[PDB]
Ligand SMILES: Nc1ncnc2c1ncn2[C@@H]1O[C@H](COP(=O)(O)OP(=O)(O)OP(O)(O)=S)[C@@H](O)[C@H]1O
Ligand SMILES: Nc1ncnc2c1ncn2[C@@H]1O[C@H](COP(=O)(O)OP(=O)(O)OP(O)(O)=S)[C@@H](O)[C@H]1O
């Protein structure tokens with residue numbers, strides 16, 4: 001504890017020797033004084049450029065929070081010393097950091113070298129971040145990330161990626177959220193695509209992905225879950241759940257899984273959300289989510305979508321459907337979703353088509369790779385197969401389930417055999433299996 | 441503290457040098473002395489005309505609140521100095537401002553130049569306000585302001601403008617608030633017109649415009665949100681949300697958006713609100729909002745209104761009638777159950793589906809918006825041939841209205857723009873012109889811009 005006080009006193013007195021001795025002895029570089037200032041901070045206010053430099057080289061943090069709450073950069077600007085401001089900025093100081101009073105390094109000092117340094121640091125940071133992010137996106141676009149997991153559905157991936165890129169590059173109106181409606185048969189990756197998109201946007205934030213299941217909303221009064229009860233009713237003080245989640249992460253990705261299962265008057269609450277990204281809870285607080293992304297998944301027109309997809313498979317063949325027939329898909333949606341204004345607010349309608357033979361083979365290969373890696377990681381068993389296995393597994397495909405049919409087929413026909421053999425201790429650790437078309 | 445006291449003493453002592461030095465240092469000009477007066481106050485009371493002038497030049501407020509609570513104009517009047525009163529009035533002092541005891545500068549003053557200055561200031565304020573407001577309204581009418589943002593809907597613009605202008609010029613009954621109901625198909629500017637009207641009435645004040653998404657009132661019990669819970673119930677200490685909002689701005693513009701999505705027993709709360717502008721919160725406090733403007737929006741009769749736009753198809757040479765409004769009524773009563781609710785609305789405004797020229801105008805407006813955004817953000821100049829709008833309008837969907845055009849333009853132009861921008865094929869200051877095929881191509885001032893490949 002004495003080391004921190006000694007370092008603070010040395011920094012206040014501009015004692016280079018004492019500051020260096022304390023730092024080399026393990027003294028807290030960001031030591032805090034009882035008055036609320038640190039060694040780097042009091043060095044900054046006292047125009048101790050050398051002390052500030054040595055403290056920064058020792059690991060001083062200039063962004064740590066009357067001048068109460070003013071950081072090291074704030075005090076450097078207060079002294080109107082440009083050398084200290086430049087050194088702190090080179091050390092990672094934020095030129096726009098704020099104190100308890102809200103003052104910033106860009107306000108304390110008069111126009112001059114300090115302002116120039118702060119502005120240049122801010123501009124260079126912003127430009128570097130912009131260029132780096134753009135280059136990263138170019139190098140590894142969203143489409144490749146989705147293709148890592150999603151198989152087929154090229155049109156849907158292209159549409160979603162185009163919309164997302166248009167949003168990220170700033171070429172989007174901020175007055176209206178972006179809304180998607182995923183349509184297609186069951187078990188073809190709609191909610192999977194939504195999950196992948198949410199992960200891409202908010203990879204390191206669970207709060208960034210808000211999931212709803214509209215099976216849990218199959219009656220009119222279920223709207224009270226979204227915004228909570230009005231004043232004087234049970235649960236009022238709680239407030240809306242969806243409103244809470246949106247307030248936590250305004251730019252999150254909201255997924256209304258199986259929206260078709262909602263009562264139609266539950267969708268009415270979505271009008272303001274989809275138009276202006278505005279929603280009011282039971283307490284009257286209004287949530288602004290203009291930059292959020294809304295995804296709705298349903299299979300309302302599944303049969304018609306499959307029939308259309310046959311168009312590609314109806315070709316004389318001597319892949320991409322124009323799908324102007326959406327004019328006759330609209331009546332189905334209107335019949336289910338009874339309000340035209342609801343559909344009008346949807347930016348894009350994404351159609352997922354049934355898998356082709358090659359896509360089915362790819363799915364089977366994906367499943368067998370997953371199982372092989374699981375076996376290697378768990379029991380250290382190598383697992384291998386040929387075309388005959390993929391084709392035999394595909395032959396058991398069911399249209400009504402898609403990827404789920406493939407999963408069940410692989411599990412039943414192959415995984416059961418691996419489990420039975422393992423339980424019989426016929427699989428020594430490190431051994432290799434070929435599935436030599438093990439059938440019938 | 442020390443600087444404020446020094447400035448106050450200098451103002452009291454008529455010390456020009458001290459007052460100037462303290463003002464230059466940064467002493468608060470409106471600092472309050474322990475006796476209740478400020479620097480300007482005591483400069484006025486001591487007949488320090490020059491000190492009053494210099495304090496006003498420094499930013500002194502003459503209208504700031506036995507001379508307890510007296511304002512600088514009050515002190516100048518009490519000093520019997522006409523110069524101080526004149527200078528304070530020139531600084532915006534109110535001749536009718538009241539002190540703690542309720543005496544105005546026109547009261548304490550002795551007959552003379554003080555009366556002249558105060559009365560001249562008051563009359564000038566009133567007449568200048570009236571004349572300037574009238575001149576601005578005539579020069580730039582609300583109807584011309586709306587036309588900048590709303591395409592078509594001439595009959596709605598004309599009705600709303602006529603009612604608004606009627607209210608502003610005082611030719612309205614103050615007992616009953618003005619109520620509008622907006623009817624028509626989806627995405628044809630109802631809420632847009634409401635927003636523009638609110639912005640016009642209250643230039644920027646957020647409290648001047650009140651939103652209410654009636655879609656959140658699908659059950660009777662939700663009406664409690666208007667007025668709050670009764671005594672003894674959770675949330676009672678908070679009053680009615682709408683009551684609070686209206687109290688903060690009695691003459692606000694209230695928008696009950698999607699009123700047809702409310703439970704019809706919830707609309708019952710609006711009977712007194714629309715008839716007399718009275719609403720009593722859960723705590724028994726009544727809100728007076730007789731001068732507010734209420735706007736409702738719905739698409740209740742929208743098939744029947746859009747079907748009556750077959751009058752555009754009648755081509756007699758080769759707009760809604762009273763008798764149509766008596767076919768649109770049965771539909772209104774079937775939805776909004778009560779004749780006493782409908783009989784409270786001042787005007788029913790009908791918004792019609794766009795004709796082909798209005799679609800072209802909408803497409804041009806959207807393209808102009810995007811061009812302005814591009815030019816401002818990246819200095820990119822954007823141009824389009826006349827045929828671009830013709831191609832784009834084909835994406836129009838009568839069921840969705842303008843937002844269909846919005847989405848079409850976005851999807852099939854802005855996507856290419858963003859793809860090119862990310863590809864860095866749009867150098868700053870470059871000129872980009874859209875050309876017309878069955879699809880849309882972009883030329884970078886002459887050569888065709890090569891479409892990037894996201895899939896690589
Ligand atoms: N196109 C796909 N490519 C790879 N895996 C997929 C694909 N689609 C689905 N899956 C996987 O198969 C499962 C199906 O999940 P979903 O994606 O959620 O199905 P769903 O289409 O979304 O439709 P429902 O809710 O049954 S209607 C998931 O386990 C996915 O991981
Ligand atoms: N003349 C116009 N008519 C309709 N929309 C316009 C017009 N000019 C601009 N717009 C824009 O097109 C969109 C139309 O949406 P809204 O203003 O909400 O119309 P609406 O009458 O309220 O349709 P509903 O009942 O909510 S489905 C708005 O975002 C407007 O800004």
Ligand SMILES: [Mg+2]
Pocket residue numbers: 187190191192257297
């Ligand atoms: Mg699903």
Ligand SMILES: [Mg+2]
Pocket residue numbers: 630631697698737
């Ligand atoms: Mg609307």
